[PDB]
Design a protein around this ligand. Structure first.
Ligand code: CA
Ligand code: CA
Lengths: 513, 510
């Protein structure tokens, strides 16, 4: 019963990919979504909280999981989602047709029958412009993995014996061997670092299977479905690979042959694939006229602040940071570039449009013309949004980066603060932000989260945390070793830790206002 | 039409060699009865059939065309020892009887699970008490990358051997020197399909459909069928201990053969296995005693760097090297004078198997100093582990061939026949011949014209004259064109070399 939330199964992200490629996805405000294999179904809750007029239906097999998730829906007071226990073959019609459909990690785990019937239902239960999402493993990535699995299995006949296998692999492959075994000790050494839940569920768990992109897309194309794209935009991106070859891949117009080849070179283990009704055209052309309407986010830190460096000279090279990540990205030289960079640093985790990025750069540096700023943008930014560095939205997420006087957080994250699932190995609680992304939360922040309903000012917070220090609960430490941090020097310690925690909540999309 | 291949490791005397290595007592070769399943043309039975006239062989294959063509090749080769027929693998166990050696090569992975196990049932019934069976199959995991690449082009080709090569090119191109996590492995195996030949890559990758299996799933299926695992026909494959030590000792400590070997498949990514099976009523001795290894005919194929006459053998300050089969890089060296003599009698006898005790003898006579047990002792110290690394070959018994040039050189009636038709690897090299070890040797054209010429009727002068006759008339061209007084001296060379190549390849029967 692991609860998870995924930012790429979020309806507002699916709509971003759809409207990115020229589709016309339905409205989010009234949207109807369906989760097949919902389990607990918290993946549906965030959206439901953000759009109260959007009804949602999860359907799972397990009655224990469905009945648990129903409790979590009552506890959090959510009216927008209903969950039922129904086998997929009990899914036909007579509820309705949904604007968004999410099938996540249940496709490769079921029989050939239901493997066809999932695409069947997704045909009949979808809507004309609706977007379908299906996650499955792939070949030939399933090969090396699956044969590692049969190795750990072939040994035993608990979880530890697998880690001792993988150990034994890395000595057996120790630095006398190097044809292939550089691929084995690599992949296996990657398998060894993983959560004991993940190794148990995937490798030592039930029986899943990898499939082929052309076999899957082909199985949908007989079900009247067309391939939209992937949630990973940095995935389908071509090159990398040399221009003399990439020119051949781009020369042909086929998405299935280009992608199906990209898996073959990259050894792609999984895929998260979007589908639409085949009656609809997709625009694979990237039209900058449409890209100025998509909100942008670049996570970047300044090396030197604006005030202390006047950049009009264009005599300098200024590195910044990307997510820090100490050694930074490329850097100018040209000021019509920097002026875009520093407005991306001002707006960090605060989405603004692409054109308004260009404008704000034109106001920060007022030497040049706007449409030349767009010449920089359209020139090269796209390559960053298709390499995964720059996020794109349309529409702007519901959240704010400003710290209000009585901060407030989503009811879903404020509920999650109470019931959050602790994990060791790093002492953290997983909390869902407005992007459906899971955030590591230190405990002393877990007490701050449930404290923001908008009722409490920052003084009741910086007070309460102190109370939990002296009343511990929370133990505060100076540098000296165990110091326990006694009076009025505590009061300036809490000002800092709370002032930082609220900032983390500001730039992680945890602040609703 | 079809590739006519003969394989050195399906030879019955080789299966006997591996049996006697493990303490078994395989049957007699002279009268031996052998069965070939999936025989195809049946050229695998022929070389052994002509070498041992008292031995009867029976090939069986589903294809009627292949069987008939086989019968033609037989009758033209004047071989009465082998009979071919067309039968589904099921219909056996009839008056066909029991055979001392059974060979199933290439049909196991290619047929249904039913016909799959039925091969092992038939193998149980038709095998004599001490007889040995041979079965080859594609093994997981190593079969997993091929079936991707073999699918990778099978995906392209619909849009054969032409476009696929362009696929492989496009592949090695797509990986630039800036992409190297894994793609080194891809780039490697794909770079390896650029090797081989149109025959192989045609029937294996594009013809299909075959499947891979696991070692324990075979050995188990045969243990279900009352057959026990003898080993593999690659002696280098059963040898572990190249991996680290701390892990090695842990692998030996268990003493479970199937577990160790299939772990080997796991970390070495094994594509193929050629497996020997025997009756589980026979104990197999996996402990190899040198005293049992000095009854084997042994071959270390080596050329000296320095000829023996220009070197003093007892100088312990001098370092001499040799070669292994050339192999442009030198192989070993010494120093030790007792070792030098061993290496020079092993280099003199290259491709002339002799017994280990006899090696210690002729080494004793080459430099007489110490006691015979000292030479035999160095061979015990480090001369083995070379036979398990694959560099030293063991026989028992001495093959029928000759290491000397007979003034009217003669060849196998099978090889002299093969030369006319033979096979071409135009991918691009040379024809394919079968020597007395059932190994296929690359033979150029000008050496094929010499090969058809050795029946024992002509001497070396007639070879030279015939080659010179075919030069100017070309046919055979000699570059760098030339005149008569040079042409004679040049043909003398390529001839006397073509005879040494035959001599040390076991192509000279007298
Ligand atoms: Ca004559
Ligand atoms: Ca001469």
């Amino acid at each position: 019963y692991p609860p998870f939330t995924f930012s790429y199964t979020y309806p507002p992200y699916l709509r971003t990919i759809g409207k990115l490629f020229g589709l016309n996805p339905p409205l989010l405000e009234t949207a109807k979504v369906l989760d097949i294999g919902c389990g607990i179904g918290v993946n549906l809750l965030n959206f439901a909280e953000t759009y109260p007029k959007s009804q949602s239906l999860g359907v799972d097999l397990s009655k224990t999981q469905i009945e648990l998730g129903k409790k979590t829906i009552s506890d959090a007071k959510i009216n927008n989602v209903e969950l039922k226990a129904l086998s997929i073959l009990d899914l036909d019609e007579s509820y309705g047709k949904f604007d968004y459909i999410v099938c996540h990690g249940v496709y490769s785990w079921v029989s050939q029958e239901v493997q066809d019937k999932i695409l069947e239902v997704l045909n009949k239960l979808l809507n004309p412009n609706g977007i379908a999402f299906v996650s499955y493993n792939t070949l030939p990535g399933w090969n090396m993995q699956n044969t590692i699995r049969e190795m750990m299995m072939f040994h035993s006949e608990k979880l530890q014996q697998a880690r001792l296998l993988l150990k034994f692999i890395n000595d057996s492959l120790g630095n006398s061997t190097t044809p292939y075994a550089n691929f084995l000790r690599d992949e296996a050494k990657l398998i060894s670092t993983y959560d004991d839940s993940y190794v148990l569920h995937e490798y030592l768990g039930e029986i899943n299977t990898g499939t082929y992109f052309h076999q899957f897309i082909e199985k949908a194309q007989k079900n009247h479905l067309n391939y939209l794209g992937d949630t990973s935009i940095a995935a389908m991106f071509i090159g990398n690979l040399p221009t003399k070859a990439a020119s051949k891949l781009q020369a042909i117009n086929d998405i299935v042959c280009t992608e199906q080849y990209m898996d073959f070179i990259t050894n792609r283990k999984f895929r998260s694939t979007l589908l639409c009704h085949q009656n609809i055209p997709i625009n694979r052309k990237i039209e900058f006229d449409n890209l100025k309407d998509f909100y942008t986010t670049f996570n970047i830190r300044p090396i030197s602040p604006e005030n202390k460096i006047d950049l009009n000279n264009e005599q300098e090279n200024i590195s910044f940071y990307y997510e820090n990540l100490p050694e930074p990205f490329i850097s100018t030289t040209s000021a019509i570039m920097k002026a875009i960079l520093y407005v991306y640093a001002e707006n960090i985790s605060n989405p603004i449009r692409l054109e308004q990025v260009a404008k704000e750069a034109f106001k920060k540096l007022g030497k040049y013309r706007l449409q030349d700023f767009l010449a920089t943008l359209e020139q090269h930014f796209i390559t960053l949004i298709f390499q995964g560095y720059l996020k794109i939205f349309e529409t702007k997420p519901h959240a704010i980066a400003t710290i209000t006087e009585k901060p407030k957080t989503s009811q879903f994250a404020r509920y999650q603060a109470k019931h959050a699932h602790f994990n060791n190995v790093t002492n953290m609680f997983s909390i869902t932000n407005r992007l459906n992304d899971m955030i590591g939360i230190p405990i002393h922040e877990k007490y701050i989260l449930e404290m923001l309903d908008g009722t409490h000012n920052i003084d009741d917070i910086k007070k309460s945390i102190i109370e939990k220090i002296n009343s511990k609960l929370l133990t505060a430490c100076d540098n000296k070793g165990q110091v326990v941090t006694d009076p009025k020097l505590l009061k300036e310690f809490v000002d800092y830790v709370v002032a930082v925690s609220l900032e983390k909540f500001r730039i992680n999309y945890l602040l609703v206002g």
